[PDB]
Amino acid sequence: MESHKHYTQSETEFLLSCAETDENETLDYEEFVKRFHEPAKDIGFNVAVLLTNLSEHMPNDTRLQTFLELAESVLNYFQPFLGRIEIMGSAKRIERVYFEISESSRTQWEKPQVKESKRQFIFDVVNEGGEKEKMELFVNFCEDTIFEMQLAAQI
Amino acid sequence: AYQQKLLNYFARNFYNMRMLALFVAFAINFILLFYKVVHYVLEESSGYMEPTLRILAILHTVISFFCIIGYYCLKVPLVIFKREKEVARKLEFDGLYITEQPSEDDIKGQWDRLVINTQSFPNNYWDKFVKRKVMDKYGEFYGRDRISELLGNSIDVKYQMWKLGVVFTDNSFLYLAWYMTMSVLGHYNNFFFAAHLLDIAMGFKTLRTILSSVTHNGKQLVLTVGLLAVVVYLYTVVAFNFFRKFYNKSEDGDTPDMKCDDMLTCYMFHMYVGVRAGGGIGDEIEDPAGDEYEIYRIIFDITFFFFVIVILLAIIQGLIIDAFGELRDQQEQVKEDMETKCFICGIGNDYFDTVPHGFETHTLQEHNLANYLFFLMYLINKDETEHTGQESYVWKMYQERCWEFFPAGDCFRKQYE
Amino acid sequence: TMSVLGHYNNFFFAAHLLDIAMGFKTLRTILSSVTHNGKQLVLTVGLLAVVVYLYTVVAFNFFRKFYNKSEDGDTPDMKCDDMLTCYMFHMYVGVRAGGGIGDEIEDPAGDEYEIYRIIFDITFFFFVIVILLAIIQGLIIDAFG
Amino acid sequence: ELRDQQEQVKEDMETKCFICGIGNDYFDTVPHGFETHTLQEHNLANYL
Ligand SMILES: Nc1ncnc2c1ncn2[C@@H]1O[C@H](COP(=O)(O)OP(=O)(O)OP(=O)(O)O)[C@@H](O)[C@H]1O
Ligand SMILES: Nc1ncnc2c1ncn2[C@@H]1O[C@H](COP(=O)(O)OP(=O)(O)OP(=O)(O)O)[C@@H](O)[C@H]1O
Ligand SMILES: Cn1c(=O)c2c(ncn2C)n(C)c1=O
Ligand SMILES: [Ca+2]
Ligand SMILES: [Zn+2]
Ligand SMILES: [Zn+2]
Question: What is the DSSP letter of B127?
C-alpha cells in the first residue's frame, strides 16, 4: 500500500485496523473488499450528486471549491456512473437531472449488435422523418435498444 | 440445458462468422479458377488440390447453416419485438381489429389478425396485460361475449405459424436463405459457389451504395429504356420498308447470303448491333455510295447516331451515375449534420462553441443521447414509491406519450449564465 | 538513386520527367486525385474483377464454341476453354472494347442459344462498360473536382 | 435543369405557405404546426 504513493502513513495504518483476527498476519482477499467497498459506492453516490448539484447550480462560490477540490478522489470515481440529462421541468423552465448509470449497462451499449442498430437509426431519422415525429422516433428507438440490451445480456 | 449453451454461442458469433463464410468462399473460387476441359481440375501446386475442395465445399454449407441459426437467435427476436409492439399499440391506443378492420392493402395488417387469438400473444413486448386493457376500454360499445372470443408438449402452434410469417417476409432473412440454398446447390455442381462473391456487395459500404443506385432512380429508368425500345423500333419500320438491300451480314454475294428482311430479325439486329456500336448503325451496313437513296440514307444514320447514341444512351448512363452522386452526398450530408448541430437541442456548432471544447462537452455531458436512454432504463428499475419530483413528471408524461419534456430549443446557457 | 542507375543504362533518365508532377501545382493535384478517393477505388475495381469473373463462369460452362481467336477452322484453332485463359481474355479484351464482349466473338445467328446469348452480351455492355467503367472514371474526375 | 426545376417546385410547396409566404419554421413550433396552418387557416381551396 505504501509503495503506490496514494495513502500517506496516517492512512496506511488506519486501513490495517484489525482486518483479520486470524493467526497468520494476513487478510482475506475478496472479503475485505466485500466488507468495506460496496457499502460505500451507493451511499457515497448521493454525496457525489450533491456536490455536483451545487457546483453546477451555484457558480461563483469561493467557499464551495474548498470542499470540492478535496472530493476529487470521489468525483473522479463516480463520473463514469453519473448520468446527466436536461428536461423541460413542469414550470416552463429547463432543469438538469442527475441519476445513476449501472455498469451492466455502460458495457452493453457496446457489443456491436447494439452499435449497428444505432447507426442504422441515426442515418434513418436525420435524413427523413419530419418535426411532427422526430422525438417520437427517438422514444420509439429507446424502447427497442432496451430490449436489445436485455438480449445481449443473456448471451 | 446443453441446447441453450450452443444456441447462445451462434448468436454471439454471427458478425464474426459471416467473415468466415467469405474467406472460405474465396478459397472455393480460387481453386475453381484452375478448371479445364468433361470438366476436370488440373494441379498447379501439387496433387492435393482436389481434396481441398471436397473438404472446403462441405465446410461451407455447414458454416452457411450456422449463420442462419445465429441469425435466428440474435436479430429475429428483435424484429418480433418491433412487430408485437406495433400491433399492441394499434388495437389499444387506436383500435384496429374491432373498429377499423383493415383494408385489402397492408397485408401485414391482414396477417396480424392471426396472432390476437393466441394464448401467449405478447411474448416479447414486456406488457402482458394488453388483453385486459382492451376489454375494459372496448367492452362497452361491443359485447364482452365477443372480445372474450376474439382475443381469448403443446406449443403455441397458432403462434409459431404466425411467427414464420414474419421471419420469411423479413428482408435480411431471405438473403441468408438464398446464401444457403446455393450451398445446397454447390454440390450438384461446383460452379454455384461463384454466386457467393456477391456477398461482397451486401458486405461493404461503398459497394452497397452502387447496388442501391441501380434501382434508387429506378422508376424513371424503366421509362427511359422503354423509350430506347421505341425509337429503335421506329428506326426498324423505316429500314424494313425502304432499305432492305443494304442489310447484308454476308460475304461477297456468292455465299448463301443472309439478310434482315423479316421484322423480328431486323429488330434484334438493330438492338444487338445498332446500340452497342460506336457509330450507331453506320458500321455494320453496306456503304451507300452508288444509290438514289443516298441522301435519304445519310439522314437515316446521322439521326440514329444523334438520338440513340448521343442522347438516349447518355441519359440512361446519367441516371445511374447521378444517383450514385445523390446517395454518396446524402451520407456526406448526414455526417455533416451530425457534426454541426445538436440532436435534441437543434441549435448549432456556433452558439455552443464560444469557449475551448464548447460543442464537445455540450454533447458529451449535457445532452448525450446515450444518457437519455439510460435515464429511461432507470425508471424501469426504480419503484413508483421512489420516483422523485422530476422522475415522475417524466414517467407520467412517458406513460401518457406527450414528449414535451425534451428540450425543444433551449438548453441551459440560453437562460442562465 | 536513379542517377546512379543512369549509367548502368542510359534509359533510366526517362524516370526523371516525373519531377514535373511533384514540381507544379496543377500537376501535383492530378497525382493526388488518383489516391485521394482511393479507399473506395479499390473496392470498385474489386467489383469489376467479380462481375467479369461471374461472366466467365457462365461463358465457360455454356458458350465454349464461340470463343475462337482463330482463322477459318483449317488452322490449329486456338480456343478459350480453360478457366485462367478464358478469364484473362474477358479482361484484356472484354473491358477495353467498345461493345463489351460482342466484338471479339463469333457471331451468333444460327444457334439455339441465340436468345440466351443476346442477353449475355447486352448485360455485359450495360453493367461493365456503361456503369462500372463510368464510376471508376467518376472517382478520379470528381476527386479532381 | 428541368428535373431540378420540378424538384425545387415540390420543395417550395413543402416549405412555405402559398398565401402567407412565411416558412415551415415559424409555423411549426408545436406538433403538426405547418400542417394545420395550411389545412385550415389558409388552404387555397377555401379561398376558391
Ligand atoms: N445529442 C448528441 N449526442 C451525441 N452526439 C451528438 C449529438 N448531437 C451531435 N452529436 C455528434 O455526434 C458525434 C458522435 O458520433 P457518432 O454518433 O457518429 O458515433 P461516434 O461517437 O463517432 O462513435 P461510433 O461512430 O463508433 O458510434 C459527436 O461527435 C457529436 O459531435
Ligand atoms: N396555401 C396552401 N394551400 C395548400 N397547400 C399548401 C399551401 N401552402 C403550402 N402547401 C403545401 O402543399 C401541399 C399540398 O400538396 P399538393 O398541393 O401538391 O396536392 P396534394 O394535397 O398532395 O394532393 P394532390 O397531389 O393529389 O393534388 C401541402 O402538403 C402543403 O404542405
Ligand atoms: C417492464 N418494462 C417496462 O415497463 C417498460 C419497458 N420499456 C418501457 N416500459 C414502459 N421495459 C423494457 C420493461 O421491461
Ligand atoms: Ca415518493
Ligand atoms: Zn443540445
Ligand atoms: Zn400562411
Answer: -
Give alpha helix (H) positions in B19-156: 23-31, 51-54, 59-69, 76-88, 107-111, 133-137, 147-150
With the C-alpha atoms ordered B68, B70, B72, B77, is the resulting torsion angle positive or negative?
negative
Q: Which ligand is nearest to the CA of B400?
A: 3
- What is the experimental method? cryo-EM
Q: Tell which residue, B282, B279, B276, B280, has the closest CA to residue B298.
A: B282
Q: Is B210 close to C81, i.e. CB distance below 8 A?
A: no
Q: How far apart are the first and last CA of chain A?
A: 38
Question: C touches A (3+ CB pairs < 8 Å)?
Answer: no
Distance CA B27, CA B199 (A): 14
How far apart are the two ends of chain C, measured CA to CA in Å?
35
Q: Which long-range contacts (CB under 8 A, 24 or more apart) does B134-142 make?
A: B134/B91, B134/B92, B134/B98, B137/B92, B138/B95, B138/B98, B138/B99, B142/B98
Instruction: Name B96's Cβ contacts closer than 8 Å, sequence gap at least 6.
Output: B90, B102, B109
C-alpha of residue B2 to centroid of ligand 1, in Å: 41
- Residues 389-408 in B contacting A (C-alpha not used; CB under 8 Å): 390-391, 393-394, 398, 401, 403-408
Please state, in angstroms and rounded to a whole number, the distance separating the CA atoms of residues B189 and B185: 7
Neighbouring C-beta atoms of residue B216, cutoff 10 Å = 17
Radius of gyration of chain D (CA): 12
* Cβ neighbours of C43 in B, within 8 Å: 204, 206-207
Pairing mode of beta strands B40-41, B35-36: antiparallel
Other beta carbons less than 10 A from residue B233's beta carbon: 13
Q: Which residue of A has its CA nearest to D35?
A: A132
Distance CA C97, CA C91 (A): 10
- Which residue of A58, A79, A81, A86 is the best one to mutate when testing the B interface, meaning the one whose CB has the most B CBs within 10 A? A86
Q: For this experimental structure, what is the resolution in angstroms?
A: 3.7
- Report residue D38 as a C-alpha cell: 395550411
Read off the amino acid at residue A147. Answer: F
Residue minimizing CA distance to atom 5 of ligand 3: B380
Nearest residue to A84 via CA among B315, C89, B194, A75:
A75
- Secondary structure (3-state) at A83: strand
Cβ-Cβ contacts under 8 Å, B367 against chain A: 85-86
Ligand 2, atom 20, lies closest to the CA of D13
Residues in chain D after which the chain is broken, C→N over 2.5 Å: none
SS3 B128: coil
